[model samples]
Target chain A: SMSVFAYESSVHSTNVLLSLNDQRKKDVLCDVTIFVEGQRFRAHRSVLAACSSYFHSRIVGQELNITLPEEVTVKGFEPLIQFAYTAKLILSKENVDEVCKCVEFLSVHNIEE
Target chain B: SVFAYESSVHSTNVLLSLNDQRKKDVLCDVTIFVEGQRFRAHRSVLAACSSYFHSRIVGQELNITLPEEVTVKGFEPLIQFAYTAKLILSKENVDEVCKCVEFLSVHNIEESCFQFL
Candidate 1:
């Protein structure tokens, strides 16, 4: 039961959104939602965590509702509002094979679940 | 309003125990507990943020309190158990600053509020 925000893990990658999993949920991963132009969109498994470290930290924090300004940005694979609520990002050409591999693995696992 | 974080693992000691009015209980910062004891190497908030500026911006939320333990040697800036200086900003005080009612400057808050406690 934690909230997560998504971001491009690094400048080298254009993979803007990384959907995080709820650390507590053995299957669901993270509570992911998207706010687009004042509308809410659900991306159950659309985004993936940038890495294991990033996923673990976001999934397992208490009082995780507040999204700090530091974690927000306008330009990315996904909008700030969506990322704030869902912790979802999209893969981009800027990302290297290694990160993309991680993302692919997470996406497949999410599908399996 | 206070927010709570659940620690399935232990609790993040925010120096509240060491610096509170009662001195009977002492809390050890990560420095004395992990480094001095030579605990197994793993991950910590300090090392994660050392390379970045936002370390100061975010991490564990500290409660309003006083300094009880002193800073550990050789770890001047990174010690989360920082003992010398602390800031306890409340919404009321922050409001005063934002409103421009008074110019912002550092003053001895302890000296001014000593009698209140």
Candidate 2:
């Protein structure tokens, strides 16, 4: 007897995200480099594009070395990028509003809480 | 609550989309030059998946040229695994592929491949 079978692995999915986050922390395979407030961040275009439509347009348009405008600062972008990889975002009363504006500027429609 | 927001589906979706981008050659940042063959990929995915590639990115560069010691036969599948998180091994080229994997200091991913043995 033969049957068409399907399998799913939530842990595998989680592991991939974890590993990608680990890679991001280590700057291992970061392809696109971003500049803001005299600081540099290295990241994967695929992840950024997957999470944020704003990034999708920028990344897809032949930008390897990118510099965000002054309106988007490290305060807004740092956690946003972290959320893109980890699916988790940390917020405080101090910076919650800033991050929200960052989300808006970047068109990160997928983020929540 | 520092641990905020949860998307059980988001990570997998990101990887799947990345795999599509890989095949379509969209938004790829790094290039691998090997034996007159060139492969375009994202460094973060490769580093997250392979220890050899991890070291390459960690220690040195983005656009890399590998020596003939690592062949297309061996390296390509690992690149596929980086983006897709899946690997395929066959009786025809297992040993040769494993040898190259070994030389590259790749991780103990052979556990999955050896399950077939």
Candidate 3:
């Protein structure tokens, strides 16, 4: 409810200011739990690199900022990696559905169906 | 080059999965030692992209599968961005890039000239 309203009002800007060690913004508290099954643990930075690779592969020539629009849906790679690295998670009630959807998408890659 | 891109591209929505129990180390953020230059740039790009993507797929439901062993985990977007950012910033002004990343290398992750930009 809060996050959704915030989203609509354009108030919640998670746009982390680009600085060294922006990891300070890793908010690791939330009621929304994303369960991705079969994920083989990889290092956080490595996995993040993998996500970045996906973007590189997908967007032929799009700018990074433009490709990942402020409103685009994430697949939970960063969250999961954060969890793997520090066992923490966070999100707003308004964003539960989207976060869950991302978990679901990531779930498919954990193990062979 | 710390990483090598084979230049071989695979087209498909490949997903990586981790369960609740498996998510033990899900530290909202775990500091990792990426190149100082890479870290800052990647941080900015990922922050922007993740937020952007989170918004795009808000209501659209898509079936995502996770394999214990997915071929790829899709993490390089930030890495490349970080590298690219470093290059661009360096090209514009090496002193600026060097100073910020130097701060990061010393474990200070939150010093930047972006505010001035």
Candidate 4:
């Protein structure tokens, strides 16, 4: 059986994406705005789609403005965005539980423990 | 400046070391041929790390032949990433990664690869 071309293309080309994501992180080249408890966070659509199917469907056509639940913290949401861009998960005792809850809500499948 | 112990520091150091190792290309045991281009690789590493190579190369010979549909353009970086788990993509080579991802079908790597495009 042949591998899924779309998935394969993405896997093989990660270096290029990571490089661009790194630049986007530095430049804040974000097209979507996420509001968590009245706090706004800028993010790239492609990054969100790749990280979670939830964002993939939601961020179509025009610009997007998403709002998480009131309990969602900046600490929780920021790290997932950071992970989406950098592929590095830096967790601490202080924020691990909050980040995990956000990750669960966002359905970020890549993150485990 | 207050410098405290951080888990990321260790991960960064590991990635740096692995990336450094990728630069050397030492101890490669197998050779892959794509469109008349040759790439040297380690069978154990690729087989152990990637499901594609694991099935294709294990219990096989040292030379692995690929069809014309397989492009060599992305194999270098693909192999490097396979061994090191790190790659630096630029505008020029980002498309190649897409093609290679289709060729490899590694989900973890695939999700990581889509951020650039």
DockQ of 2: 0.37
Error of 4 at A63 (Å): 2.5
Question: Where does model 2 sit among the CAPRI classes?
Answer: acceptable
lDDT of 2 by residue, B24-92 (tens): 888776788877788987766666666777777765636888888778876776666656655556655
lDDT of 1 by residue, B17-105 (tens): 21231122212123223123321111122222222211321343222121223212213212212211232323333333222211211
Point out the worst 10-residue segment of candidate 3 chain A by lDDT. Answer: A1-10
Question: How do all the candidates rank in terms of lDDT, highest first?
Answer: 2, 4, 3, 1
Which of the numbered candidates is closest to the native, going by highest lDDT? 2
Q: Regarding DockQ, does 1 or 2 come out ahead?
A: 2
> Can you list each candidate's DockQ?
0.03, 0.37, 0.03, 0.02
Off by over 4 Å in 4: A1-14, B1-117
Whole-model lDDT per candidate: 0.25, 0.72, 0.28, 0.58
Stretches off by above 4 angstroms in model 2 are A1-42, A63-76, A92-97, B1-3, B33-36, B59-73, B108-112, B115-117
Q: How high is each candidate's TM-score?
A: 0.17, 0.69, 0.21, 0.43
True-structure lDDT of candidate 2: 0.72
- Of all native A–B interface contacts, model 2 reproduces a fraction of 0.43
Which portions of model 3 miss their true places by more than 4 Å? A1-47, A51-53, A59-63, A69-87, A91-94, A104-113, B1-117
